[PDB]
Design a protein around this ligand. Structure first.
Ligand SMILES: [Ca+2]
Lengths: 171, 223
């Protein structure tokens, strides 16, 4: 039914949440420049355990009060600090296709951005979830691709995935 | 409802609240035993609350009845947002009175321009959120299909109507889903989806009930 945060409350449709790792090994989700990016355009899982990440606004086009499993979603980062050259970067999550490490989750303006919706599905006693992307059924798990040069944990559409997350309310 | 007003108490007697812990969707009473709502409001456990005005306070007029049958349209498509309609059979009939009454199903579809009343306990802000205790009301016209199709290119099916204002400022919103759009005493829309709330050029999109009258009659009769 409703997706629940780590306090057991249904996610508010349009609310802001930290997307935290299910294990104590990693921090939350944020943005980092990767490859030849000069702005933080790659959606990544922080390697710093203390790092909550950036608050993410989770919403469905449906005018239901709470986020339900299986409903189509849009994700976008709440405002975060960037250098002046990067101010005004769009913060909606996109899946940009035919990238080296497979279809990757990016923010900013993407011409290659696949049409589709994210959805949440429960995996776990504890309130654990995975993200899937459904291009506009046939849906792919979001998992992690480790940058070889960087070590950066990039969010990608990954068959042998998925990333398991829990939510914590900003409020 | 963004930009509406507080309805007069029990002046929308067909309005219901679907409650699963708290209010999460609306719906409409179409006879003593059946409620119509949005398919995306489907949940395994639902309590229907009738006769409500202040959903936070017991006023003495309420009837709380559990859903017995919950039947989503057989062609509902979660990710194309299409055929977004569901019927709930109450586990016992509502007592019909001044505060609890049925709304009529449409005899035909509504013409563009027809003024309608939308109601619900959803968010009243287009930025941030504020959920009201008291039922909110809004008068808004059916938009032309060409207007509607141009607002959401590629997304509008034949089972969807747009109701509202291209200027924005007034719209239904999160928590209004499943609730009624009533024009000329007939249920013509079910609150379904939109991009944000009350945004310019982004009107609300509603399930086109006049397409479903036979399915509705058919389901009630067989069940
Ligand atoms: Ca009450």
């Amino acid at each position: 039914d409703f997706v629940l945060d780590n306090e057991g409350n249904p996610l508010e449709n349009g609310g802001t949440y930290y997307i935290l790792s299910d294990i104590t090994a990693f921090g939350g989700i944020r943005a980092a420049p990767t490859g030849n990016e000069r702005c933080p355009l790659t959606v990544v899982q922080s390697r710093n355990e203390l790092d909550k990440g950036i608050g993410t606004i989770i919403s469905s086009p449906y005018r239901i009060r709470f986020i339900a499993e299986g409903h189509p979603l849009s994700l976008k980062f709440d405002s975060f600090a960037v250098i002046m050259l990067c101010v005004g970067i769009p913060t909606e999550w996109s899946v940009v296709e035919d990238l080296p490490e497979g279809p990757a989750v990016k923010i900013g303006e993407n011409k290659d951005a696949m049409d589709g919706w994210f959805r949440l599905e429960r995996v776990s006693e504890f309130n654990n979830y995975k993200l899937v992307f459904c291009p506009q059924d046939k849906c792919g798990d979001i998992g992690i691709s480790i940058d070889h040069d960087d070590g950066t944990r990039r969010l990608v559409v990954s068959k042998n995935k998925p990333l398991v997350v829990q939510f914590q309310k900003l409020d | 409802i963004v930009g509406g007003y507080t309805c007069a108490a029990n002046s929308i007697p067909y309005q219901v609240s679907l409650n699963s812990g708290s209010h999460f969707c609306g719906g409409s009473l179409i006879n003593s035993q059946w409620v119509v709502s949005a398919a995306h409001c489907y949940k395994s456990r639902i309590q229907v609350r009738l006769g409500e005005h202040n959903i936070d306070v017991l006023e003495g007029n309420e009837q709380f009845i559990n859903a017995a049958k919950i039947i989503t349209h057989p062609n509902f498509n979660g990710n194309t947002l299409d055929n977004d309609i569901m019927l709930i059979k109450l586990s016992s009939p509502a007592t019909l009175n001044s505060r609890v009454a049925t709304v009529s199903l449409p005899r035909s579809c509504a013409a563009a321009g027809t003024e309608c009343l939308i109601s619900g306990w959803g968010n009243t802000k287009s930025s941030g959120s504020s959920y009201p205790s008291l039922l909110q009301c809004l008068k808004a016209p059916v938009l032309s299909d060409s207007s509607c199709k141009s607002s959401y290119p590629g997304q509008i099916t034949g089972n969807m109507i747009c109701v509202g204002f291209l200027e924005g400022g007034k719209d239904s919103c999160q928590g209004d889903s499943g609730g009624p759009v009533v024009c000329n005493g007939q249920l013509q829309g079910i609150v379904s989806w939109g991009y944000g709330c009350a945004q310019k050029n982004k009107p609300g999109v509603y399930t086109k009930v006049c397409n479903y009258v036979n399915w509705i009659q058919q389901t009630i009769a067989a069940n």
